[PDB]
């Protein structure tokens, strides 16, 4: 626990640890939701992880993402040393400067590429599921959650699949560090990987995402090698540590809820709406901002340089935003969340992510309609900048499945 700063009143202290929350065994979203109990103020100070503010309600989270003059993306991660080393583009930049880089990132991960990759996304989902179908069991995180999104990103990026173990290790040290590497060390190893590839693709431009970023233009002028690396690094993290985790939270839920499986089996056209409700209930990201100057926000004095965690996960879990927020309702009329961000840094890979999710739900339920958590298993979650699932053993009777 770090020393309570003079300007922070004792009454706003709530020592929540975002990398190892106290109620983790009840589920990671349940763990973070203890910040929304009756007794907790809208804005708390935790002495964990060097000390920082935590906005616990959607209203505050949304408001702070909107106000980039007061809440800057220059230092967006806790701990402070990770935020300071963080220099990915466009996420480490505030408008106006940030905006020219979004258009180039959109070219490689936006709807354009989702349409280039439509056939391969569909084919890989169906192939991986058909291969598992006759087995009557799988380790979902290793057998589908990782390979499906990761192989698609490595295809898009023109990178060999043999590089996956190394890159997935490094990306995971930036979001759920095990202690072996600091953020700065993981980030520099990621750049060390990309440096030579970017120079080669600048000399001999190809069709892959690294070539397109490395030879791209930003508001009509050529991107620099340095800028290309800082954008590429960010795409590698997005590709290897977002959807990968979300798919396991969703499959864990479906394995525990036969009535929700039945609803999507009976009415497959509800899968897009089901995806959005699952994106709210199993929201999983939490980054934040740094105060650019002293500022009074919602009755609380904030000081220049103070870090504030604005958990994207928390907005849709707020009861003031959604009634009975821990219940999954595929017919929920107004599904409000900030799972993909809020403000000018809204996720650019959200269309790729929703396609991957929707394809997985549809193709899994077509072939393996009935499945459950392996008998006796207790599913364990992990927390960080992006939360996840440690392992997800599933079982089913092959006699209830069908080959397409
Ligand atoms: C379930 C999946 C995903 C979730 C929940 C998610 C969540 C987020 C969030 C919350 C942000 C904003 C961060 C901030 O404001 O500091 C963000 C930004 C971004 N995400 Fe996604 N993401 C997902 C998938 C992806 C994928 C597959 C990619 C592909 C690389 C990707 C690429 C990006 C990019 C490039 C940005 C930066 C936009 C900017 O800073 O202007 N994301 N994402
Ligand atoms: C917070 C995020 C999910 C968003 C995209 C990848 C991520 C870890 C970043 O560094 C930005
Ligand atoms: K920084």
Resolution of the coordinates, Å = 1.6
Give the C-alpha distances (Å, rounded to integers) separating 2 from 8, 336, 341: 12, 35, 29
Q: Is 75 annotated as a binding residue?
A: no
Tokens encoding 13: 């202290």
* 135 Cα–ligand 1 center, Å: 34
Q: Which domain holds residue 294?
A: 1-404
Spatial distance between the Cα atoms of 190 and 201, rounded to a whole number of angstroms:
17
Query: What technique determined this structure?
Result: X-ray
Cβ contact 240:168 at 8 Å: yes
CA distance 241 to 102: 20
Ligand 1 close to Cβ of residue 232 (< 6 A): no
- CA 309 to chain CA centroid, Å, is 15
CB contact at 8 A, 114 and 355:
yes
Ligand 2 test: best mutation among 87, 186, 234, 344, most atoms within 8 Å of CB? 234
CATH of the domain at 290: 1.10.630.10
Q: Which ligand is nearest to the CA of 88?
A: 2
- Are 21 and 30 contacting, i.e. CB atoms less than 8 angstroms apart? no
Distance 238 CA to ligand 2 centre (A): 6
Whole-angstrom Cα distance, residue 94 to residue 90?
A: 8
Instruction: Give the Å distance between the CA of 98 and the centre of ligand 3.
Output: 14
DSSP helix/strand/coil, 62: helix
Structural domain count of the chain: 1
Q: Active-site residue 267, yes or no?
A: no
Structure tokens at 55: 């906005």
Best substitution site from 18, 89, 171, 175 to test ligand 2's pocket, by max atoms within 8 Å of Cβ?
175
CA 84 – CA 307 distance, rounded (Å): 11
């Amino acid at each position: 626990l770090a020393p309570l700063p003079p300007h922070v009143p004792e009454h706003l202290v709530f020592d929540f640890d975002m990398y190892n929350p106290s109620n983790l065994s009840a589920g990671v979203q349940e763990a973070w939701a203890v910040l929304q109990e009756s007794n907790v103020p809208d804005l708390v100070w935790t002495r964990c992880n060097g000390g920082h503010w935590i906005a616990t309600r959607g209203q505050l989270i949304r408001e702070a993402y909107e106000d980039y003059r007061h809440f800057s993306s220059e230092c967006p991660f806790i701990p402070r040393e990770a935020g300071e080393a963080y220099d990915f583009i466009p996420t480490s930049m505030d408008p106006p400067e940030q905006r020219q880089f979004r258009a180039l990132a959109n070219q490689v991960v936006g709807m354009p590429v989702v349409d280039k990759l439509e056939n391969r996304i569909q084919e890989l989902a169906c192939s991986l599921i058909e291969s598992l179908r006759p087995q009557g069991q799988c380790n979902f995180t290793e057998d589908y959650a990782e390979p499906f999104p990761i192989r698609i990103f490595m295809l898009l990026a023109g990178l060999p699949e043999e590089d996956i173990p190394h890159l997935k290790y490094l990306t995971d040290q930036m979001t759920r560090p095990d202690g072996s590497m600091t953020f700065a060390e993981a980030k520099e190893a990621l750049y060390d990987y990309l440096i030579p590839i970017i120079e080669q693709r600048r000399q001999k431009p190809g069709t892959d995402a690294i070539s397109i970023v490395a030879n791209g233009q930003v508001n009509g002028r050529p991107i620099t090698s340095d800028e290309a690396k800082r954008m590429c690094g960010l795409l590698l993290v997005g590709g290897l540590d977002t959807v990968v985790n979300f798919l396991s939270f969703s499959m864990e839920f479906l394995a525990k809820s036969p009535e929700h499986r039945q609803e999507l089996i009976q009415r497959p056209e509800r899968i897009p709406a089901a995806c959005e409700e699952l994106l709210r209930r199993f929201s999983l990201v939490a980054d934040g901002r740094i105060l650019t100057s002293d500022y009074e926000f919602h009755g609380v004095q904030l000081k220049k340089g103070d870090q504030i965690l604005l958990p994207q996960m928390l907005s849709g879990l707020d009861e003031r935003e959604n009634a009975c927020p821990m219940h999954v309702d595929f017919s929920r009329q107004k599904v409000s969340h900030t799972t993909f961000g809020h403000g000018s840094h809204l996720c650019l890979g959200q269309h790729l992510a929703r396609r991957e999710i929707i394809v997985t739900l549809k193709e899994w339920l077509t072939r393996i309609p009935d499945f459950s958590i392996a008998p006796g298993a207790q599913i364990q979650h992990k927390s960080g900048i992006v939360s996840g699932v440690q392992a997800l053993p599933l079982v089913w009777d092959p006699a209830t499945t069908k080959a397409v």
